[PDB]
Amino acid sequence: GAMGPKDIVDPATPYPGDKVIITEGAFEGFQAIFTEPDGEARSMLLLNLINKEIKHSVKNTEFRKL
After folding, report:
1. Do the beta carbons of residue 13 and residue 7 sit within 8 Å?
2. What structural domains and CATH numbers belong to the chain?
3. 62, exposed or middle or buried, with CB in 10 Å at 0-12, 13-18, 19+?
4. If we measure between CA atoms, which residue out of 25, 55, 28 comes closest to residue 43?
5. Which domain of life is it from?
6. Residue 19: which residues within 8 A CB-CB, separation 6 or more?
7. How far does Cα 37 stand from its chain's mean position?
8. CB-based contact 61:42 (threshold 8 Å)
9. Residue 66 gets which letter from DSSP?
């Protein structure tokens, strides 16, 4: 939108249900959905596996939002 930021911190926090992508760890290249982040520092993402769906808590620095 506007070139200048509306506030000091923008709504970078991803909403629940959004798709996320991992860039670090053997799970890199796998998409996950925010199941419920305990805080802005750590977040809970769901890793879908051809065998079954698994839930794992990853740090926002360990993965990035699409």
Report:
1. no
2. 1-66 (2.30.30.30)
3. middle
4. 55
5. Bacteria
6. 31, 32, 33, 66
7. 9
8. no
9. -
41/63 Cα distance (integer angstroms): 12
Select from 51, 15, 50 the least CA-distant residue to 33.
Answer: 15
The tokens describing 46, both together, are: 């769901």
Tokens of 9: 């911190």
**Whole-angstrom distance, CA of residue 34 vs CA of residue 45:** 4
| Structure-determination technique | NMR
The DSSP result for 1-65, as a single string, is: --SS-SSSS-S-SPPTT-EEEE-SSTTTT-EEEE---SSSSEEEEEEE-SS-EEEEEEETTTEEE
Across the chain, which distance is largest between two alpha carbons, in Å?
A: 46
